[PDB]
């Protein structure tokens, strides 16, 4: 159920090579809160920005939830070549997302020989393990 303490969810970004604005997945409910994948191009050389967002729409300022997560870009040819990074973060209203602005090089993820992109689609996955929240279910 939505009260579960962990879940894995995926979001496939289409027309990936043409991405310009941040894109957001539908919510996955864990600890009864909505978690989402956020992806955007970033520049510093171009990189994939990949973030996990928690409970961002709520106007509450009382809530918090600590979670650990694995953020993964799927390699569709060989899951052993999928690329992942781990985070731990206390999510709350003023810091409702966390991840990596330079998760991977854009030129690598979009390289058709590497196995992450197919039909201009790239799939992102999050495994999130969340603690019981505070300041929500009183």
């Amino acid at each position: 159920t939505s009260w579960r303490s962990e879940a894995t969810f995926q979001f496939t970004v289409e027309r990936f090579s043409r991405l310009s604005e941040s894109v957001l997945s539908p919510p996955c409910f864990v600890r009864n809160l909505p978690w989402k994948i956020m992806v955007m191009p970033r520049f510093y050389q171009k990189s994939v920005g990949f973030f996990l967002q928690c409970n961002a729409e709520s106007d509450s300022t009382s809530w918090s939830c600590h979670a650990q997560a694995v953020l993964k870009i799927i390699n569709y040819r060989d899951d052993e070549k999928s690329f992942s990074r781990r985070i731990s973060h206390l999510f709350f209203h003023k810091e409702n997302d966390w991840g990596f602005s330079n998760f991977m090089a854009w030129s690598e993820v979009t390289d058709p020989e590497k196995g992450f992109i197919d039909d201009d689609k790239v799939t992102f996955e999050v495994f999130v393990q969340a603690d019981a929240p505070h300041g929500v279910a009183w």
């Binding site: 973030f51 966390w98 990596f100 602005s101 998760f103």
Partner: peptide
């Protein structure tokens, strides 16, 4: 660096 942190 992988740029760990918030999106904004």
């Amino acid at each position: 660096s992988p740029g760990e942190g918030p999106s904004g």
